[PDB]
């Protein structure tokens, strides 16, 4: 309504990976055993 | 032109509008200043707006009975002026909303040519009964001055 | 006037509620039948019109099978029968059920309690959220509840004591997922969040306590010893009485970093006290020892942004400032450069109380340390691995999507973790 | 709250249910008259999960005995614990099923559902909060398999929220209990893949080794095997009936176990099982329960788990014990023999505990395994089916009931896909 025929038609990332990151291995942990074997038990 | 797809399986009938076209005797063309992508067509029933790359008409501002003549864009990018067979000029906008103003009895009958100043401060109207006039236009107040430029016949162009 | 609201959510929520509330009833001579034979108890209780001292807490859960034990245990004359909220069907270790299906139909009840639990409250310090992340009720209800608490009070402070999934010990398989979903809802809503893992507290019971058959009832008898030490200033006289707002101002540098560690010392058997003196000097060296952490994080891989030390018992400030001074010099402990300070210290003259049948020893000096460190990114990146290892196959998803959830809520709650770990690296 | 309704289909079901309701009854200290004669208040608090109060202090089970040829019902209607059942819960047909899956599912079964459903709803609505259904089948014969599945498809739609269990006894590999066994097997499997939340599989073969190897029995009668199956069906709902420091509802046992909606076949065991001579030597410690349950001998199904990988697993310990020894043991195995556990699931065991062991023991357990060796039951069945459907043997009995033949092939494609689902997820 405002005589704006120019305004009539409008014409116009990887997350990251931490350094600490790592899978827990059965070492550096005093709660459990300290080996990994195929079919021991 | 409609594409009516009907399936009797569920008895469902849906229509689509493929293409539209003007009715008859497109009177006037208009380009918005410094714009080569959209244009406007004044016809014998109402004003339609189209664009360049595709037909895909944008809107149809309707006036029921009397026909439009010599559609015009106010300079520098502004309202659309349209003089009708009534002898009256009317202004619309981009979405064109509601009539910006109606200069009524702008001529005796059937105003035929319409032009604007480069400053969008006055509007020329050449009528079919061989007369030329100009109206001064403020921002929200219109000025009806009495130029009365007499010409020898219908004003085809201004 | 110096009062807090103690919420317990889930099973481990009320599992620690039985340890904490067995402490305050004993620490103030409050018999299990309410009455005892001011402001020493007004932090946790509310004297009625005659004699009775009801607590100000709320036990919330979905399985009655535990909340009814409180109804039949010796602490049944204690609680207002409406505080012990319970449900009919449970969350079934499914974050969606605890958030979308079942959570929405009892929060309207729980909230009415809080409104009727805060009117008698004249000056409220802050809410106290005992939560167990890893279950539907712990993660779902907790998340849905916290958002409701933010929009009601906002200005009040929420403290989050959330048990976190340990690296090795895991009593579930899908506990990676609902532990991730909890972050997006706790982070913006808790004012500060303490963490502790069921695994780290196990080894504490091995070296120090020398107890070889540990059980959940043992560990909870340690957490209660933290909050008792944490809120001693609220209810017991002492040099440098430390409120909550003070505690919170000088510990959280940025609105994001509010995930902190805990410790306690001394933790010893009732017989090795005969082989030690446990001076203020000796304890504070053990609070900063990595094996005395209650979480399986290694502070030697990171840096300290602040620490807070709440001492208790026969302790005078001349020895606090001395033992703290010989720590800033120690090479192992690295403090991030933009804080040359970093210690808010608190002293009390009320030594830690001991419960009959407990494992700790009667001592006259005790320390509880709560540090905000940048090494906390470790335990937070393991989750970013197990979640990305199982979610690669959409395993167990059809349970979450079937309970009024979607697939976006997984990737959304995943980026929030990356958005967080950068914040633990921008501070380098 | 949290009630359970129980179905017994077929001759086998009407006989396992005899021992099941004998075992559970004693555990809750109720007489074959139905009067409670126990000692503790622990029996009464969760008695309504299986029974209903009645005038005179009786407790009548919530079972439904359905069978054609009521002859076998006349046995249990006459046994020692036969006086407890409601007589209106006995629904039976005057004719026979003939070990024919068709007429047990199409002609005769279709004549009883109109009455059976009035039975199941009459006692499904008396439940203030229904938890789920549980059935006991036999995939060899006609009544158990045929009517069982037809009962399920009616149940699956009427109650889709609740959960249906299935202790289906499947055929034996080395000996054939019937001749038309493979036809009844697949045609029933094709119903279980779509209309069952969980489904345990058992085998009379493996039920013989445990009595021939472990129990070292001499004359193992079905009266003893059913005392084995009843020991696991009682071992599942302990957390529903008895409190424990880590409870496990029936629903949270599936979401932690079934990654994809079609791998709902499991594998069970029980511990401890010793001779009457060896009970003098072997001790009862969590390290003992944990190795015998994990072994490849107590698997009550005839499928060696050492031919595939464990997707997930479970364990329902019973008896006041140390919750740490349980957690470190089940962990110790996964990383010990890491070749039988999948890698895209970091921790794939759930662990429950109960303060209440069996009636005559101090420690006990119960195992549930979801292994990719369960496909071996399907191969051995998929071949015996295609050896005789290839020549159209014994089919005039199945087509004589108006059956099609694509219902046979659809039963084979559905199976021969289920045998591949168990192989993508088994990368060896
Ligand atoms: N320190 C401690 N941790 C516990 C205790 N009980 C359970 N946990 C841990 O809490 C986690 C599961 O939380 P729960 O509260 O049992 O589950 P939930 O939040 O109620 O959700 P649902 O199981 O679906 O009802 C597990 O990892 C437990 O190791 C306890 O008594 N003390
Ligand atoms: N554990 C156990 N299994 C049985 C017993 N009796 C039969 N079964 C099995 O049930 C199978 C036959 O199915 P059956 O129940 O007799 O036919 P139905 O009446 O149509 O269901 C056979 O494989 C039997 O071995 C029993 O007493 N104890
Ligand atoms: Mg729980």
Coordinates of N, CA and C in Angstrom, one line a residue, chain B:
Chain B
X1 N -6.4 -22.1 -17.5 CA -6.3 -23.6 -17.8 C -6.1 -24.3 -16.5
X2 N -7.0 -25.3 -16.3 CA -6.9 -26.1 -15.1 C -6.6 -27.6 -15.4
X3 N -5.9 -28.2 -14.5 CA -5.6 -29.7 -14.6 C -6.4 -30.3 -13.5
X4 N -7.5 -30.9 -13.9 CA -8.4 -31.6 -12.9 C -8.1 -33.1 -12.9
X5 N -7.4 -33.5 -11.9 CA -7.1 -34.9 -11.7 C -8.2 -35.5 -10.8
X6 N -8.9 -36.5 -11.4 CA -10.0 -37.1 -10.7 C -9.7 -38.6 -10.7
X7 N -9.8 -39.2 -9.5 CA -9.7 -40.7 -9.3 C -11.0 -41.3 -8.8
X8 N -11.7 -42.1 -9.5 CA -12.9 -42.7 -9.0 C -12.7 -43.7 -7.9
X9 N -11.5 -44.1 -7.6 CA -11.3 -45.1 -6.6 C -11.8 -44.7 -5.3
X10 N -11.4 -43.5 -4.8 CA -12.0 -42.9 -3.6 C -12.9 -41.7 -4.0
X11 N -13.3 -41.6 -5.2 CA -14.1 -40.5 -5.7 C -13.6 -39.1 -5.3
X12 N -12.3 -38.9 -5.6 CA -11.6 -37.7 -5.2 C -11.3 -36.9 -6.4
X13 N -11.6 -35.6 -6.4 CA -11.4 -34.7 -7.6 C -10.7 -33.5 -7.1
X14 N -9.4 -33.3 -7.5 CA -8.6 -32.2 -7.2 C -8.2 -31.5 -8.5
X15 N -8.3 -30.2 -8.4 CA -8.0 -29.3 -9.6 C -6.7 -28.5 -9.2
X16 N -5.9 -28.2 -10.3 CA -4.8 -27.4 -10.2 C -4.9 -26.3 -11.3
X17 N -4.3 -25.2 -11.1 CA -4.3 -24.1 -12.1 C -2.9 -24.1 -12.8
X18 N -2.9 -24.6 -14.0 CA -1.6 -24.7 -14.7 C -1.2 -23.3 -15.3
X19 N -2.0 -22.7 -16.1 CA -1.6 -21.5 -16.7 C -2.8 -20.5 -16.8
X20 N -2.5 -19.2 -16.6 CA -3.5 -18.1 -16.7 C -3.1 -17.3 -17.9
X21 N -4.1 -16.6 -18.5 CA -3.8 -15.7 -19.6 C -4.8 -14.5 -19.4
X22 N -4.4 -13.4 -20.0 CA -5.3 -12.2 -20.0 C -6.6 -12.5 -20.7
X23 N -7.6 -11.6 -20.5 CA -8.9 -11.9 -21.1 C -9.0 -11.4 -22.5
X24 N -8.9 -10.1 -22.8 CA -9.0 -9.6 -24.1 C -8.5 -8.1 -24.2
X25 N -7.9 -7.7 -25.2 CA -7.5 -6.3 -25.5 C -6.8 -5.7 -24.4
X26 N -5.6 -6.2 -24.1 CA -4.6 -5.7 -23.2 C -4.4 -4.2 -23.6
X27 N -4.8 -3.3 -22.8 CA -4.7 -1.9 -23.1 C -3.3 -1.3 -23.0
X28 N -2.7 -1.4 -21.8 CA -1.5 -0.7 -21.5 C -0.4 -1.6 -20.9
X29 N 0.8 -1.3 -21.2 CA 2.0 -1.9 -20.6 C 2.7 -0.9 -19.7
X30 N 3.4 -1.5 -18.7 CA 4.1 -0.6 -17.8 C 5.3 -1.4 -17.2
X31 N 6.5 -0.7 -17.1 CA 7.7 -1.2 -16.5 C 8.0 -0.3 -15.3
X32 N 8.2 -0.9 -14.1 CA 8.8 -0.1 -13.0 C 10.1 0.5 -13.4
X33 N 10.4 1.7 -13.1 CA 11.6 2.4 -13.5 C 12.8 1.7 -12.9
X34 N 13.8 1.5 -13.8 CA 15.1 0.8 -13.5 C 14.8 -0.6 -13.0
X35 N 13.8 -1.3 -13.5 CA 13.5 -2.6 -13.2 C 13.1 -3.4 -14.5
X36 N 13.9 -4.4 -14.8 CA 13.7 -5.2 -16.0 C 13.4 -6.7 -15.6
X37 N 12.6 -6.9 -14.6 CA 12.3 -8.2 -14.2 C 10.8 -8.4 -14.0
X38 N 10.0 -7.4 -13.6 CA 8.6 -7.4 -13.4 C 7.9 -6.3 -14.3
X39 N 6.7 -6.6 -14.8 CA 6.0 -5.6 -15.5 C 4.5 -5.7 -15.2
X40 N 3.7 -4.8 -15.7 CA 2.3 -4.8 -15.4 C 1.5 -4.5 -16.6
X41 N 0.3 -5.2 -16.7 CA -0.5 -5.1 -17.9 C -1.9 -4.6 -17.4
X42 N -2.3 -3.4 -17.9 CA -3.7 -2.9 -17.8 C -4.5 -3.5 -18.9
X43 N -5.6 -4.2 -18.6 CA -6.6 -4.7 -19.5 C -7.9 -4.1 -19.4
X44 N -8.9 -4.6 -20.1 CA -10.2 -4.1 -20.2 C -11.1 -4.5 -19.0
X45 N -10.6 -5.3 -18.1 CA -11.3 -5.6 -16.9 C -10.6 -5.2 -15.6
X46 N -9.3 -5.3 -15.6 CA -8.5 -5.1 -14.4 C -7.0 -5.2 -14.6
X47 N -6.2 -4.9 -13.6 CA -4.8 -4.8 -13.8 C -4.1 -6.1 -13.3
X48 N -3.3 -6.7 -14.2 CA -2.5 -7.9 -13.8 C -1.0 -7.5 -13.8
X49 N -0.3 -8.3 -13.0 CA 1.2 -8.1 -12.8 C 1.9 -9.4 -13.1
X50 N 2.9 -9.3 -14.0 CA 3.7 -10.5 -14.4 C 5.1 -10.1 -14.2
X51 N 6.0 -11.1 -14.4 CA 7.4 -10.9 -14.3 C 8.1 -11.6 -15.5
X52 N 9.5 -11.3 -15.6 CA 10.2 -11.7 -16.8 C 10.4 -13.2 -16.9
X53 N 11.1 -13.8 -16.0 CA 11.7 -15.1 -16.2 C 10.6 -16.2 -16.4
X54 N 9.4 -15.9 -15.9 CA 8.3 -16.8 -16.0 C 7.0 -16.0 -16.1
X55 N 6.0 -16.6 -16.7 CA 4.7 -15.9 -16.7 C 4.2 -15.6 -15.3
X56 N 3.7 -16.6 -14.6 CA 3.5 -16.6 -13.1 C 3.0 -15.3 -12.6
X57 N 1.9 -14.8 -13.2 CA 1.4 -13.5 -12.8 C 1.2 -13.4 -11.3
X58 N 1.5 -12.2 -10.8 CA 1.6 -12.0 -9.4 C 0.3 -11.7 -8.7
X59 N -0.4 -10.7 -9.2 CA -1.7 -10.4 -8.7 C -2.6 -9.7 -9.8
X60 N -3.9 -9.7 -9.5 CA -4.9 -9.1 -10.4 C -5.8 -8.2 -9.6
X61 N -5.5 -6.9 -9.6 CA -6.3 -5.9 -9.0 C -7.6 -5.6 -9.8
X62 N -8.7 -6.0 -9.3 CA -10.0 -6.0 -10.0 C -10.8 -4.8 -9.8
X63 N -11.4 -4.3 -10.9 CA -12.4 -3.3 -10.9 C -13.5 -3.8 -11.8
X64 N -14.7 -4.0 -11.2 CA -15.7 -4.8 -11.9 C -16.1 -4.4 -13.3
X65 N -16.7 -3.2 -13.5 CA -17.4 -2.9 -14.8 C -16.5 -2.1 -15.8
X66 N -16.0 -0.9 -15.4 CA -15.4 0.0 -16.3 C -13.9 -0.4 -16.4
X67 N -13.3 -0.1 -17.6 CA -12.0 -0.6 -18.0 C -10.9 0.4 -17.8
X68 N -9.7 -0.1 -17.6 CA -8.5 0.7 -17.3 C -7.9 1.1 -18.6
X69 N -7.2 2.3 -18.6 CA -6.4 2.8 -19.7 C -5.1 3.3 -19.2
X70 N -4.0 3.2 -20.0 CA -2.7 3.8 -19.8 C -2.2 3.7 -18.3
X71 N -2.0 2.4 -17.9 CA -1.4 2.2 -16.7 C 0.0 2.9 -16.6
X72 N 0.4 3.3 -15.4 CA 1.6 4.0 -15.3 C 2.2 3.8 -13.9
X73 N 3.6 3.8 -13.8 CA 4.3 3.7 -12.6 C 4.7 5.1 -12.2
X74 N 4.4 5.6 -11.0 CA 5.0 6.8 -10.5 C 6.5 6.7 -10.5
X75 N 7.2 7.8 -10.8 CA 8.6 7.7 -11.1 C 9.4 7.2 -9.9
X76 N 10.7 6.8 -10.1 CA 11.7 6.5 -9.1 C 11.3 5.3 -8.3
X77 N 10.2 4.6 -8.6 CA 9.7 3.5 -7.8 C 8.6 3.9 -6.8
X78 N 7.4 3.8 -7.2 CA 6.2 4.3 -6.4 C 4.9 3.7 -6.9
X79 N 3.8 4.3 -6.5 CA 2.5 3.8 -6.8 C 2.2 3.5 -8.3
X80 N 1.1 2.8 -8.6 CA 0.6 2.6 -9.9 C -0.6 3.5 -10.1
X81 N -0.6 4.3 -11.2 CA -1.7 5.1 -11.6 C -2.4 4.4 -12.7
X82 N -3.8 4.6 -12.7 CA -4.6 3.9 -13.7 C -5.8 4.8 -13.9
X83 N -6.0 5.3 -15.1 CA -7.1 6.1 -15.5 C -8.1 5.2 -16.3
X84 N -9.4 5.4 -15.9 CA -10.4 4.4 -16.3 C -11.4 5.1 -17.3
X85 N -12.2 4.3 -18.0 CA -13.2 4.8 -18.9 C -14.2 5.7 -18.2
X86 N -14.3 5.6 -16.8 CA -15.2 6.5 -16.1 C -14.8 8.0 -16.3
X87 N -13.6 8.3 -16.6 CA -13.1 9.6 -16.5 C -12.4 9.9 -15.1
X88 N -11.9 8.9 -14.4 CA -11.3 9.1 -13.1 C -10.0 8.3 -13.1
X89 N -9.1 8.9 -12.4 CA -7.8 8.3 -12.1 C -7.8 7.7 -10.7
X90 N -7.1 6.6 -10.6 CA -7.0 6.0 -9.2 C -5.6 5.4 -9.1
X91 N -5.1 5.5 -7.8 CA -3.8 5.0 -7.5 C -3.8 3.8 -6.6
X92 N -2.9 2.8 -6.9 CA -2.7 1.6 -6.2 C -1.3 1.5 -5.8
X93 N -0.9 0.5 -5.0 CA 0.4 0.3 -4.6 C 1.0 -1.0 -5.0
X94 N 2.1 -1.4 -4.5 CA 2.7 -2.8 -4.8 C 1.8 -3.9 -4.5
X95 N 1.6 -4.2 -3.2 CA 0.5 -5.0 -2.8 C -0.9 -4.4 -3.1
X96 N -0.8 -3.0 -3.3 CA -1.9 -2.2 -3.9 C -3.0 -2.1 -3.0
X97 N -3.1 -2.9 -1.9 CA -4.0 -2.6 -0.8 C -5.3 -2.0 -1.2
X98 N -5.5 -0.8 -0.7 CA -6.7 0.0 -0.9 C -6.3 1.3 -1.7
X99 N -7.3 1.8 -2.4 CA -7.0 2.9 -3.4 C -6.3 4.1 -2.8
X100 N -5.1 4.4 -3.2 CA -4.4 5.5 -2.6 C -5.1 6.8 -2.7
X101 N -5.7 7.1 -3.9 CA -6.6 8.2 -4.1 C -7.3 8.0 -5.4
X102 N -8.4 8.8 -5.5 CA -9.3 8.8 -6.7 C -9.5 10.2 -7.2
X103 N -8.8 10.6 -8.2 CA -9.0 11.9 -8.9 C -10.2 11.8 -9.8
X104 N -11.4 12.1 -9.3 CA -12.6 11.9 -10.1 C -13.0 13.0 -11.0
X105 N -13.6 12.7 -12.1 CA -13.9 13.7 -13.2 C -12.6 14.3 -13.7
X106 N -11.5 13.4 -13.7 CA -10.2 13.9 -14.2 C -10.3 14.4 -15.6
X107 N -11.2 13.9 -16.4 CA -11.6 14.4 -17.7 C -13.1 14.3 -17.9
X108 N -13.5 14.7 -19.1 CA -15.0 14.6 -19.4 C -15.4 13.1 -19.4
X109 N -14.7 12.3 -20.2 CA -15.0 10.9 -20.3 C -13.7 10.2 -20.8
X110 N -13.4 9.1 -20.2 CA -12.3 8.2 -20.7 C -11.0 8.9 -20.9
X111 N -10.4 9.2 -19.7 CA -9.0 9.6 -19.7 C -8.2 8.5 -20.4
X112 N -7.2 9.0 -21.3 CA -6.6 8.1 -22.2 C -5.1 8.0 -22.1
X113 N -4.4 9.1 -21.7 CA -3.0 9.0 -21.5 C -2.7 9.6 -20.1
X114 N -1.7 9.0 -19.4 CA -1.3 9.5 -18.1 C 0.2 9.4 -17.9
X115 N 0.8 10.4 -17.4 CA 2.2 10.5 -17.2 C 2.5 11.1 -15.8
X116 N 3.7 11.0 -15.3 CA 4.1 11.6 -14.1 C 5.4 12.4 -14.3
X117 N 5.6 13.3 -13.3 CA 6.9 14.0 -13.3 C 8.0 13.1 -12.8
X118 N 9.2 13.5 -13.2 CA 10.4 12.9 -12.7 C 10.6 13.0 -11.2
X119 N 9.9 13.9 -10.5 CA 9.9 14.0 -9.1 C 8.7 13.4 -8.4
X120 N 7.8 12.8 -9.2 CA 6.5 12.3 -8.7 C 5.7 13.3 -7.9
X121 N 5.8 14.5 -8.4 CA 5.1 15.7 -7.8 C 3.8 16.1 -8.6
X122 N 3.7 15.8 -9.8 CA 2.6 16.2 -10.6 C 2.3 15.0 -11.6
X123 N 1.0 14.9 -12.0 CA 0.5 13.9 -12.9 C -0.3 14.5 -14.0
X124 N 0.1 14.2 -15.2 CA -0.5 14.6 -16.5 C -1.6 13.6 -16.9
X125 N -2.7 14.1 -17.3 CA -3.8 13.2 -17.7 C -4.4 13.9 -19.0
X126 N -4.2 13.2 -20.1 CA -4.8 13.6 -21.4 C -6.0 12.7 -21.7
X127 N -7.2 13.4 -21.7 CA -8.5 12.7 -21.9 C -8.9 12.5 -23.3
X128 N -10.0 11.8 -23.5 CA -10.4 11.5 -24.9 C -11.1 12.6 -25.6
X129 N -11.9 13.4 -24.8 CA -12.4 14.7 -25.3 C -11.4 15.8 -25.2
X130 N -10.3 15.5 -26.0 CA -9.4 16.6 -26.4 C -9.0 17.6 -25.4
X131 N -8.5 17.1 -24.3 CA -8.1 18.0 -23.2 C -6.9 17.4 -22.5
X132 N -6.0 18.2 -21.9 CA -4.9 17.8 -21.1 C -5.0 18.6 -19.8
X133 N -4.7 17.8 -18.7 CA -4.7 18.5 -17.4 C -3.5 17.9 -16.6
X134 N -3.2 18.6 -15.5 CA -2.2 18.1 -14.6 C -2.6 18.4 -13.2
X135 N -2.3 17.4 -12.3 CA -2.7 17.5 -10.9 C -1.4 17.5 -10.0
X136 N -1.4 18.5 -9.1 CA -0.3 18.5 -8.2 C -0.6 17.5 -7.0
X137 N 0.4 16.8 -6.6 CA 0.3 15.7 -5.6 C 1.3 15.9 -4.5
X138 N 0.8 16.0 -3.3 CA 1.6 16.1 -2.1 C 1.9 14.7 -1.6
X139 N 2.1 14.6 -0.3 CA 2.4 13.3 0.3 C 1.1 12.6 0.7
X140 N 0.3 13.2 1.5 CA -1.1 12.6 1.8 C -2.2 13.5 1.3
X141 N -1.9 14.8 0.9 CA -2.9 15.7 0.4 C -2.8 15.9 -1.1
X142 N -3.9 15.7 -1.8 CA -3.9 15.9 -3.3 C -4.3 17.3 -3.6
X143 N -3.8 17.8 -4.7 CA -4.0 19.2 -5.2 C -4.6 19.2 -6.6
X144 N -5.8 19.7 -6.7 CA -6.6 19.6 -8.0 C -6.5 21.0 -8.7
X145 N -5.4 21.2 -9.4 CA -5.2 22.5 -10.0 C -5.9 22.6 -11.4
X146 N -6.1 23.8 -11.9 CA -7.0 24.0 -13.1 C -6.1 24.4 -14.3
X147 N -5.1 23.6 -14.6 CA -4.4 23.8 -15.9 C -5.3 23.9 -17.1
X148 N -6.1 22.9 -17.3 CA -7.0 22.9 -18.5 C -6.3 23.2 -19.8
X149 N -5.3 22.4 -20.1 CA -4.6 22.5 -21.4 C -5.5 21.9 -22.5
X150 N -6.0 22.8 -23.4 CA -6.9 22.4 -24.5 C -6.1 21.9 -25.7
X151 N -6.5 20.7 -26.1 CA -5.9 20.1 -27.3 C -7.0 19.8 -28.4
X152 N -6.5 19.4 -29.5 CA -7.4 19.4 -30.7 C -8.1 18.1 -30.8
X153 N -7.7 17.0 -30.2 CA -8.3 15.7 -30.2 C -7.9 14.8 -29.1
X154 N -8.3 13.5 -29.1 CA -8.0 12.6 -28.1 C -6.4 12.5 -28.0
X155 N -6.0 12.4 -26.7 CA -4.5 12.4 -26.4 C -4.1 10.9 -26.4
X156 N -3.5 10.5 -27.5 CA -3.0 9.1 -27.5 C -1.8 8.8 -26.6
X157 N -0.9 9.8 -26.4 CA 0.3 9.6 -25.6 C 0.7 10.9 -25.0
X158 N 1.4 10.8 -23.9 CA 2.0 11.9 -23.2 C 3.3 11.5 -22.6

